[PDB]
Amino acid sequence: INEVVTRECTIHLAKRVHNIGFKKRAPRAIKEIRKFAEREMGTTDVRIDTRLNKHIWSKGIRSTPFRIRVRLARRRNDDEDSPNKLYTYVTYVPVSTFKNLQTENVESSDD
RNA sequence: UGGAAGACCGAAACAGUUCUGACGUGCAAAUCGAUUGUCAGAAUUGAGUAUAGGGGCGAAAGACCAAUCGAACCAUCUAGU
RNA sequence: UGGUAUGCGUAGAAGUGUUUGGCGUAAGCCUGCAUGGAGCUGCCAUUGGUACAGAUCUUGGUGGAUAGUAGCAAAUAAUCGAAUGAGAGCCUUGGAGGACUGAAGUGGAGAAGGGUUUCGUGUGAACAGUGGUUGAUCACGAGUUAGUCGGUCCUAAGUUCA
RNA sequence: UAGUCGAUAGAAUAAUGUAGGUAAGGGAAGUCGGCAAAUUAGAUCCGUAACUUCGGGAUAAGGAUUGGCUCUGAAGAUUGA
RNA sequence: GAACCCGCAGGUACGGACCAAUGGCACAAUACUUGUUCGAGCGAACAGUGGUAUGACGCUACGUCCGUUGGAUUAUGCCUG
RNA sequence: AAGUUUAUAAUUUACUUUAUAAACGACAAUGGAUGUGAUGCCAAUGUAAUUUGUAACAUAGUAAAUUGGGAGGAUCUUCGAUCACCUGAUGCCGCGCUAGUUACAUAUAAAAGCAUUAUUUAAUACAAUGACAAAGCCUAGAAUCAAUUGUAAACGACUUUUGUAACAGGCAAGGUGUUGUAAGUGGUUGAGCAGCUGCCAUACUGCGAUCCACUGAAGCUUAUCCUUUGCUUGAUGAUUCGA
RNA sequence: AACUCUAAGCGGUGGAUCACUCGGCUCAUGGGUCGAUGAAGAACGCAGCAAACUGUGCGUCAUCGUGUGAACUGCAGGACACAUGAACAUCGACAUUUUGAACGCAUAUCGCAGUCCAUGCUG
């Protein structure tokens, strides 16, 4: 049951990050953004964009942005077929002031 | 004003005070941390070089002389008793 | 080992595994079966480097500890992630990204030392107490050009010796 | 800047550790012993003993003060009017 | 001169709980602050938790709360004999 | 001398209680059996590693079945959604009959064996268990792993979890905290300072810690906060177990 | 169940045991054969392919002469020159590096002279 719908989802990193050892704070942030992505889209195959890279990592490892605005896009696995016909594509939509945003159901496929 | 001193605090440097700490089948047949002595001179040190076994060298502990010193190491006497 | 059974023997010797059967109080013996491949044994005398469980024995091998318990922990230490491959956190690598040593350097040169270790290419097992396509590994090639820099020469401490 | 990011890693991040800290109130009662730890520390100013070989003791003791901004003064060089 | 059982309240020592208050710790939370870096600024990063003031979910103290009631019968006092 | 009882006279729920008379006077007895609801080894009138079958007489005298209702019982025990007892009703298979005495007939028995125990039985009876193909009745779980909670924890384990809803999870929102007034913008707030000065009042243009207003704000909020007709999303893996 | 124990079969692990051996060991026998005419030993470079062993020295895995008479051999260049010779032995003719007694002097230097003869260049 493929679905292949894209929505821009909400993650508060800070709680997950809380009391985890520094320097492992954002190797845990990336892993947890995958964990959230995997729970939402149901697809084990999580890909994280190179735009997503820089937005966690700008403010260097001790001060990971407490709340992050996520774009989660469930897409079809093309060539050399993974056992999971789906993959989720995770990118950051560049906002400095994420709070107050509830998740919205349309990103049109070919951005 | 000047800038003396085997002067003092303390780096590089050298050493190893106390924890009688870590380690102590370790990284290491002597290391590691903290702490600390000394640091312009009887200082620190490289290379070349001299001194060789019952000998040397010793700011002298019987310390050290190639992880070895109350007499090195190696072979032989020696399958010593 | 001398003699002997006109001994046995590649048609399977010796060796050896062996809930084969049996003998002897035992030391030990024979035989079957399987394996084997090139030589061997009984008896009478004859000689010994002659029989092993040990000697904090020797030498080689192997267990329990323990397919994992010590550990592989100091210098924070990664990480997104593109490429490739049999496999890729490192090691292959860009881009990116967190930092490190913090010019008294984990830098840039040389001596003392090293000895091909430098470098390209190939790149697998072993090695890198982890992986490892990569390396100071492993395989295959190349490279160190001087009248002026050192050695050379010179003397020192000191030495070789007519 | 140049060079690293290799010190096998991940998840958990238990006890006990190690290495680094903090702890009211009391404040060495602890212990062999203030060991370990803490206080103290730079600078400028003020003040400064016993004792003394008159050099020191001395950073004695005991006190004050230190940011930022905004002003002000002092401290030099050279020709010219 | 019975601090003597009935009766009453408190504490001690021991033990077990519990974190509300109060106190302790640091979220490397928030602020402030120094040194440096991001052109400055915001907001951060680095000083292996940078320091300092405050400091919650949470843990935990020195904090507080809770710790039963009979029989058998010893010692012993006794009946009847 | 502790004591088992009977009976008469009383007495009682209780071989209890009272008086009279006796009695097994820890005898020998008694302790196996009164098999004490008089078992067996009987039924079998030939009792048997065959079963007996069939006739009469008279005495004693036997019983086979079913259903309903009312009350009762259970201390480690072979079926507490079980087994009784009593009472009433229904009918009729007459299925059995036994003991005594007596009639009639017969298979086993003649198991060779003269040494019959030896290697030492099983038709049968009763009790349990089985299950090949098949047959006759009844009924349609969960556990554990993954994922999940934190009340739990080194790891297992413990405690929670998963119905398009009592949902569960990630947010945003709100409550609750914590710190202490953000950015940005405006103000001569502001000791002051530079630099240009008019045909006349004079000043302005920048700089300036900090203050004020927007701003009891901004940030942070529990992961081990509380809450949600708000948002979106999940709802789609593994193994094994029986009387 | 799993594991453990005990035994057995089979597979590993491991190289004992046996049988073999161009070697070792000991006794006996014959001979006397290093060197300034430059030794023994060392270093160095050498095979078509070699890195060693072994062989050799710049003529480098070997050359004359002599004997025999067709290989070497892993692959090959070769093989031809098998009748004048392979290849091995013999090895009496030569070569026999840099050294080392080691000899011009030295040697953490393959370093530095002198002399005679000789060559090229320049003249």
PDB file of N, CA and C (backbone and C1' of nucleotides) in Angstrom, chain C residues 72-73 78 89-91 98-101 105 107, chain D residues 1-10 17-18:
ATOM      1  P     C C  72      40.955  -1.908  27.056  1.00  0.00           P
ATOM      2  O5'   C C  72      41.020  -1.804  25.476  1.00  0.00           O
ATOM      3  C5'   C C  72      42.221  -2.211  24.828  1.00  0.00           C
ATOM      4  C4'   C C  72      42.013  -2.493  23.345  1.00  0.00           C
ATOM      5  C3'   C C  72      40.978  -1.711  22.556  1.00  0.00           C
ATOM      6  O3'   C C  72      41.477  -0.428  22.175  1.00  0.00           O
ATOM      7  C1'   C C  72      40.646  -3.998  22.112  1.00  0.00           C
ATOM      8  P     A C  73      40.469   0.671  21.622  1.00  0.00           P
ATOM      9  O5'   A C  73      39.783   1.246  22.953  1.00  0.00           O
ATOM     10  C5'   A C  73      40.456   2.069  23.863  1.00  0.00           C
ATOM     11  C4'   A C  73      39.451   2.745  24.785  1.00  0.00           C
ATOM     12  C3'   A C  73      39.997   3.918  25.591  1.00  0.00           C
ATOM     13  O3'   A C  73      40.175   5.061  24.750  1.00  0.00           O
ATOM     14  C1'   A C  73      38.591   2.729  27.035  1.00  0.00           C
ATOM     15  P     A C  78      36.484   9.755  15.038  1.00  0.00           P
ATOM     16  O5'   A C  78      35.381   8.875  14.404  1.00  0.00           O
ATOM     17  C5'   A C  78      34.114   9.164  13.740  1.00  0.00           C
ATOM     18  C4'   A C  78      33.039   9.835  14.646  1.00  0.00           C
ATOM     19  C3'   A C  78      31.620  10.039  14.097  1.00  0.00           C
ATOM     20  O3'   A C  78      30.914   8.813  14.168  1.00  0.00           O
ATOM     21  C1'   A C  78      32.260  11.973  15.049  1.00  0.00           C
ATOM     22  P     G C  89      30.814   0.754   7.134  1.00  0.00           P
ATOM     23  O5'   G C  89      30.543   2.130   7.855  1.00  0.00           O
ATOM     24  C5'   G C  89      30.005   3.271   7.134  1.00  0.00           C
ATOM     25  C4'   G C  89      30.434   4.588   7.824  1.00  0.00           C
ATOM     26  C3'   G C  89      31.965   4.792   7.854  1.00  0.00           C
ATOM     27  O3'   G C  89      32.405   5.470   6.677  1.00  0.00           O
ATOM     28  C1'   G C  89      31.181   5.069  10.061  1.00  0.00           C
ATOM     29  P     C C  90      33.713   4.894   5.985  1.00  0.00           P
ATOM     30  O5'   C C  90      34.957   5.277   6.931  1.00  0.00           O
ATOM     31  C5'   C C  90      35.062   6.678   7.270  1.00  0.00           C
ATOM     32  C4'   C C  90      36.252   6.996   8.203  1.00  0.00           C
ATOM     33  C3'   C C  90      37.679   6.489   7.767  1.00  0.00           C
ATOM     34  O3'   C C  90      38.577   7.591   7.870  1.00  0.00           O
ATOM     35  C1'   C C  90      36.910   5.482   9.968  1.00  0.00           C
ATOM     36  P     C C  91      39.628   8.066   6.835  1.00  0.00           P
ATOM     37  O5'   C C  91      40.870   7.145   6.569  1.00  0.00           O
ATOM     38  C5'   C C  91      41.681   6.221   7.255  1.00  0.00           C
ATOM     39  C4'   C C  91      41.528   4.743   6.798  1.00  0.00           C
ATOM     40  C3'   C C  91      41.652   4.579   5.295  1.00  0.00           C
ATOM     41  O3'   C C  91      43.006   4.758   4.922  1.00  0.00           O
ATOM     42  C1'   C C  91      40.137   2.949   6.162  1.00  0.00           C
ATOM     43  P     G C  98      30.422  23.223  11.254  1.00  0.00           P
ATOM     44  O5'   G C  98      30.752  22.275  12.505  1.00  0.00           O
ATOM     45  C5'   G C  98      29.664  21.895  13.339  1.00  0.00           C
ATOM     46  C4'   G C  98      30.150  20.780  14.274  1.00  0.00           C
ATOM     47  C3'   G C  98      31.432  21.113  14.982  1.00  0.00           C
ATOM     48  O3'   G C  98      31.082  21.905  16.108  1.00  0.00           O
ATOM     49  C1'   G C  98      31.680  19.120  14.096  1.00  0.00           C
ATOM     50  P     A C  99      31.942  23.203  16.450  1.00  0.00           P
ATOM     51  O5'   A C  99      33.074  22.558  17.362  1.00  0.00           O
ATOM     52  C5'   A C  99      34.459  22.731  17.046  1.00  0.00           C
ATOM     53  C4'   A C  99      35.208  21.473  17.393  1.00  0.00           C
ATOM     54  C3'   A C  99      36.720  21.624  17.489  1.00  0.00           C
ATOM     55  O3'   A C  99      37.408  22.070  18.639  1.00  0.00           O
ATOM     56  C1'   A C  99      36.196  19.730  16.180  1.00  0.00           C
ATOM     57  P     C C 100      38.944  22.524  18.529  1.00  0.00           P
ATOM     58  O5'   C C 100      39.807  21.226  18.818  1.00  0.00           O
ATOM     59  C5'   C C 100      39.925  20.333  19.904  1.00  0.00           C
ATOM     60  C4'   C C 100      41.005  19.400  19.410  1.00  0.00           C
ATOM     61  C3'   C C 100      42.283  20.101  18.993  1.00  0.00           C
ATOM     62  O3'   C C 100      42.830  20.228  20.294  1.00  0.00           O
ATOM     63  C1'   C C 100      41.659  18.745  17.214  1.00  0.00           C
ATOM     64  P     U C 101      43.600  21.432  20.940  1.00  0.00           P
ATOM     65  O5'   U C 101      44.993  21.031  20.284  1.00  0.00           O
ATOM     66  C5'   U C 101      45.722  19.827  20.642  1.00  0.00           C
ATOM     67  C4'   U C 101      46.823  19.682  19.597  1.00  0.00           C
ATOM     68  C3'   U C 101      47.697  20.910  19.349  1.00  0.00           C
ATOM     69  O3'   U C 101      48.748  20.956  20.293  1.00  0.00           O
ATOM     70  C1'   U C 101      47.043  20.273  17.391  1.00  0.00           C
ATOM     71  P     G C 105      56.764  23.184  19.054  1.00  0.00           P
ATOM     72  O5'   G C 105      55.290  23.293  18.529  1.00  0.00           O
ATOM     73  C5'   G C 105      54.181  22.938  19.383  1.00  0.00           C
ATOM     74  C4'   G C 105      53.197  22.037  18.643  1.00  0.00           C
ATOM     75  C3'   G C 105      53.789  20.821  17.909  1.00  0.00           C
ATOM     76  O3'   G C 105      52.847  19.703  17.942  1.00  0.00           O
ATOM     77  C1'   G C 105      52.799  22.200  16.407  1.00  0.00           C
ATOM     78  P     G C 107      52.861  16.878  12.712  1.00  0.00           P
ATOM     79  O5'   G C 107      53.006  18.295  11.939  1.00  0.00           O
ATOM     80  C5'   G C 107      51.849  18.633  11.118  1.00  0.00           C
ATOM     81  C4'   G C 107      52.098  20.027  10.544  1.00  0.00           C
ATOM     82  C3'   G C 107      53.292  20.268   9.608  1.00  0.00           C
ATOM     83  O3'   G C 107      53.013  19.784   8.310  1.00  0.00           O
ATOM     84  C1'   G C 107      53.297  21.876  11.045  1.00  0.00           C
TER      85        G C 107
ATOM     86  P     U D   1      42.660  28.802   7.559  1.00  0.00           P
ATOM     87  O5'   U D   1      44.163  28.584   7.154  1.00  0.00           O
ATOM     88  C5'   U D   1      44.737  29.517   6.194  1.00  0.00           C
ATOM     89  C4'   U D   1      46.283  29.342   6.144  1.00  0.00           C
ATOM     90  C3'   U D   1      46.780  27.865   6.002  1.00  0.00           C
ATOM     91  O3'   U D   1      46.785  27.514   4.610  1.00  0.00           O
ATOM     92  C1'   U D   1      47.947  28.874   7.761  1.00  0.00           C
ATOM     93  P     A D   2      46.270  26.042   4.184  1.00  0.00           P
ATOM     94  O5'   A D   2      47.362  25.149   4.932  1.00  0.00           O
ATOM     95  C5'   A D   2      48.632  25.017   4.299  1.00  0.00           C
ATOM     96  C4'   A D   2      49.570  24.174   5.164  1.00  0.00           C
ATOM     97  C3'   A D   2      48.998  22.789   5.467  1.00  0.00           C
ATOM     98  O3'   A D   2      49.275  21.860   4.375  1.00  0.00           O
ATOM     99  C1'   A D   2      49.885  23.882   7.474  1.00  0.00           C
ATOM    100  P     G D   3      48.358  20.580   4.195  1.00  0.00           P
ATOM    101  O5'   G D   3      48.457  19.851   5.589  1.00  0.00           O
ATOM    102  C5'   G D   3      49.662  19.056   5.846  1.00  0.00           C
ATOM    103  C4'   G D   3      49.577  18.421   7.271  1.00  0.00           C
ATOM    104  C3'   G D   3      48.403  17.480   7.586  1.00  0.00           C
ATOM    105  O3'   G D   3      48.714  16.152   7.095  1.00  0.00           O
ATOM    106  C1'   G D   3      48.661  19.056   9.326  1.00  0.00           C
ATOM    107  P     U D   4      47.568  15.124   6.670  1.00  0.00           P
ATOM    108  O5'   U D   4      47.101  14.514   8.091  1.00  0.00           O
ATOM    109  C5'   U D   4      46.078  15.219   8.804  1.00  0.00           C
ATOM    110  C4'   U D   4      46.101  14.760  10.274  1.00  0.00           C
ATOM    111  C3'   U D   4      44.878  13.871  10.593  1.00  0.00           C
ATOM    112  O3'   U D   4      45.208  12.485  10.551  1.00  0.00           O
ATOM    113  C1'   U D   4      44.724  15.942  11.809  1.00  0.00           C
ATOM    114  P     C D   5      44.136  11.530   9.911  1.00  0.00           P
ATOM    115  O5'   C D   5      42.855  11.739  10.761  1.00  0.00           O
ATOM    116  C5'   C D   5      42.700  11.077  12.028  1.00  0.00           C
ATOM    117  C4'   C D   5      41.467  11.589  12.756  1.00  0.00           C
ATOM    118  C3'   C D   5      40.080  11.455  12.123  1.00  0.00           C
ATOM    119  O3'   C D   5      39.566  10.161  12.289  1.00  0.00           O
ATOM    120  C1'   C D   5      40.233  13.559  12.753  1.00  0.00           C
ATOM    121  P     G D   6      38.976   9.397  11.061  1.00  0.00           P
ATOM    122  O5'   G D   6      39.855   8.097  11.015  1.00  0.00           O
ATOM    123  C5'   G D   6      39.860   7.282  12.208  1.00  0.00           C
ATOM    124  C4'   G D   6      41.148   6.424  12.314  1.00  0.00           C
ATOM    125  C3'   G D   6      41.432   5.937  13.723  1.00  0.00           C
ATOM    126  O3'   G D   6      40.769   4.712  14.066  1.00  0.00           O
ATOM    127  C1'   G D   6      43.313   6.835  12.902  1.00  0.00           C
ATOM    128  P     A D   7      39.472   4.722  14.987  1.00  0.00           P
ATOM    129  O5'   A D   7      40.046   4.600  16.450  1.00  0.00           O
ATOM    130  C5'   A D   7      40.965   5.536  17.003  1.00  0.00           C
ATOM    131  C4'   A D   7      42.300   4.839  17.139  1.00  0.00           C
ATOM    132  C3'   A D   7      42.344   4.024  18.434  1.00  0.00           C
ATOM    133  O3'   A D   7      43.310   2.961  18.349  1.00  0.00           O
ATOM    134  C1'   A D   7      43.731   5.986  18.550  1.00  0.00           C
ATOM    135  P     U D   8      43.005   1.604  17.635  1.00  0.00           P
ATOM    136  O5'   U D   8      41.485   1.668  17.188  1.00  0.00           O
ATOM    137  C5'   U D   8      40.423   1.118  17.949  1.00  0.00           C
ATOM    138  C4'   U D   8      39.143   1.040  17.135  1.00  0.00           C
ATOM    139  C3'   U D   8      37.848   1.521  17.811  1.00  0.00           C
ATOM    140  O3'   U D   8      37.773   2.934  17.713  1.00  0.00           O
ATOM    141  C1'   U D   8      37.537  -0.688  16.728  1.00  0.00           C
ATOM    142  P     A D   9      36.938   3.713  18.819  1.00  0.00           P
ATOM    143  O5'   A D   9      35.437   3.345  18.425  1.00  0.00           O
ATOM    144  C5'   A D   9      34.903   3.963  17.211  1.00  0.00           C
ATOM    145  C4'   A D   9      33.614   3.337  16.760  1.00  0.00           C
ATOM    146  C3'   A D   9      32.380   3.549  17.595  1.00  0.00           C
ATOM    147  O3'   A D   9      31.835   4.853  17.331  1.00  0.00           O
ATOM    148  C1'   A D   9      32.528   1.294  16.959  1.00  0.00           C
ATOM    149  P     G D  10      30.745   5.431  18.338  1.00  0.00           P
ATOM    150  O5'   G D  10      29.541   4.448  18.147  1.00  0.00           O
ATOM    151  C5'   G D  10      28.594   4.624  17.108  1.00  0.00           C
ATOM    152  C4'   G D  10      27.494   3.606  17.242  1.00  0.00           C
ATOM    153  C3'   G D  10      26.566   3.773  18.459  1.00  0.00           C
ATOM    154  O3'   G D  10      25.609   4.845  18.200  1.00  0.00           O
ATOM    155  C1'   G D  10      27.173   1.634  18.362  1.00  0.00           C
ATOM    156  P     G D  17      33.711   3.462  44.148  1.00  0.00           P
ATOM    157  O5'   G D  17      35.044   3.063  43.451  1.00  0.00           O
ATOM    158  C5'   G D  17      35.634   4.005  42.570  1.00  0.00           C
ATOM    159  C4'   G D  17      36.305   3.240  41.431  1.00  0.00           C
ATOM    160  C3'   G D  17      37.179   4.054  40.513  1.00  0.00           C
ATOM    161  O3'   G D  17      38.472   4.133  41.086  1.00  0.00           O
ATOM    162  C1'   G D  17      35.747   2.877  39.188  1.00  0.00           C
ATOM    163  P     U D  18      39.022   5.483  41.680  1.00  0.00           P
ATOM    164  O5'   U D  18      39.640   6.139  40.389  1.00  0.00           O
ATOM    165  C5'   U D  18      40.697   5.400  39.733  1.00  0.00           C
ATOM    166  C4'   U D  18      40.679   5.734  38.269  1.00  0.00           C
ATOM    167  C3'   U D  18      40.773   7.259  38.060  1.00  0.00           C
ATOM    168  O3'   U D  18      42.165   7.665  38.166  1.00  0.00           O
ATOM    169  C1'   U D  18      39.086   6.421  36.692  1.00  0.00           C
TER     170        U D  18
END
